[PDB]
Design a protein around this nucleic acid. Structure first.
Lengths: 49, 143
RNA sequence: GUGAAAUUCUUGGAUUUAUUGAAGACUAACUACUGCGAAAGCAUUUGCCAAGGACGUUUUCAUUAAUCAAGAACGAAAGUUAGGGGAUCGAAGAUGAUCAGAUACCGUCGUAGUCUUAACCAUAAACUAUGCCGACUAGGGAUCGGGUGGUGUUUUUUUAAUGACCCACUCGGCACCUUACGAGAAAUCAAAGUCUUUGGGUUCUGGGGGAGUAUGGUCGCAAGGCUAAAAAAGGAAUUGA
RNA sequence: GGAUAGUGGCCUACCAUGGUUUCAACGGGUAACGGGGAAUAAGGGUUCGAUUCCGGAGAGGGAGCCUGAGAAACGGCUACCA
């Protein structure tokens, strides 16, 4: 027998930066200024709805 | 040299580098964009209101089994039906049809000998009053 | 000419022999765990043109440096455009034999290409599968280039070169052999090491396989628009009844 | 020069072509009022701060003014929109 090792070639897409920029707009840019405040108001508002 | 710069005037390069890689972290992105409550079991809320469609497993024989405890409710902000546990076949008598239950999570730590997988919600209140109060006979279910 | 034959071309004598002539490629053996170059790459001779490493130097300027997006140069082979010749080999293609076995699946001819000029294209298992600069940390011999010293043999002597081998030291290479008081998952590593948890300078980058599923997240691709058919022992059989 | 209580492209003339930025200008997002402060971990940091004090802004939303030492006041007035 022969045991020819095979090789990995390259990647296609696993990067968080391009996963962000892959939209037509910038998901990094469209953000908020107080994420904890947003989280607790989202909790309370969902409960009231 | 561990890749990073170390000079005493390099705080600008250090800060911008850390900003980019913070954005590339996973949970930071969810927390800043507001999608953790889009990954939550039924959206952001703690409990979730529903309409009782049918009491499943009524035609089972052996009492107090999990397929007898189960119901099928449809959540009202989605029109989406899903099952729900109800402890105590007495409380199954309390929930009948067109009832507006308030489901919550299940939050089990271990399974049981006859449990159904994937039934992740339980019933907390029915028609405005609590199932435990109705079971303990503190209150009365108002039609 | 294959494993086997057959298309093919041979009395206007093929294959072969001799004497040549032309053509375009190519540069065998000599060929090395040798050399040069930033890499891809580079082998006939001689001449010209510039360039470069290393050595040697009681020469010279005196921080002129290191790492670095943008951009630039170069980038094997194939490939494109427009010219050149076109011997050899030859994706496509045309054919012969389709013979059991593929153990031992080809043969003949040949377009493009191969080669060369001018422009594009800019990719490879383009590999020491390992950012760069600096420093330190084991021994052993080699081999190439330069230099210093000594010792002889080969050498030659008022002629134009005084080189070759030996040994010791020495820089600078291509590498190799033993091992680590080190590192590690282990193979292994003189770096993938620099005393338990960490600072010599600096650019880039990150937060396994198949499967099953949903897609508004997206790019692409379709067809036809006169046209039709209605149960069998009523067996088998040189083997039967 | 006008205007203002007063400086000032604040505004009007006439003039020069300047000003900011890879040390990130400009423009975008902000469930952005700023601060004293609140929570947490060993340090470093990170997250909250509409909310007893301080400052700014607003009175359904554009705009405008009267009185007055003090207001572009809204428990003052005028016109528009809702």
């Amino acid at each position: 027998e022969q045991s020819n090792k095979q090789h990995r070639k390259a990647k296609e897409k696993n990067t968080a930066k391009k996963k962000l920029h892959t939209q037509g707009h910038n998901a990094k840019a469209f953000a908020v200024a107080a994420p904890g405040k947003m989280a607790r108001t989202m909790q309370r508002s969902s409960d009231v709805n | 040299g561990k890749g990073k710069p170390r000079g005493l005037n390099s705080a600008r390069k250090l800060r911008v580098h850390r900003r980019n890689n913070r954005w590339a972290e996973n949970n930071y992105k969810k927390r800043l964009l507001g999608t953790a409550f889009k990954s939550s079991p039924f959206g952001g809320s703690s409990h979730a209101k529903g309409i009782v469609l049918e009491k499943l497993g009524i035609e089972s024989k052996q009492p107090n089994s999990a397929i007898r405890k189960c119901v099928r409710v449809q959540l009202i902000k989605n029109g989406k039906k899903v099952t729900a546990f109800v402890p105590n076949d007495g409380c199954l008598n309390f929930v009948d049809e067109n009832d507006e239950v308030l489901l919550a999570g299940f939050g089990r730590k271990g399974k049981a000998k006859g449990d159904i997988p994937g039934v992740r919600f339980k019933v907390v209140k029915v028609s405005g009053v609590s199932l435990l109060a109705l079971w303990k006979e503190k209150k009365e279910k108002p039609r």
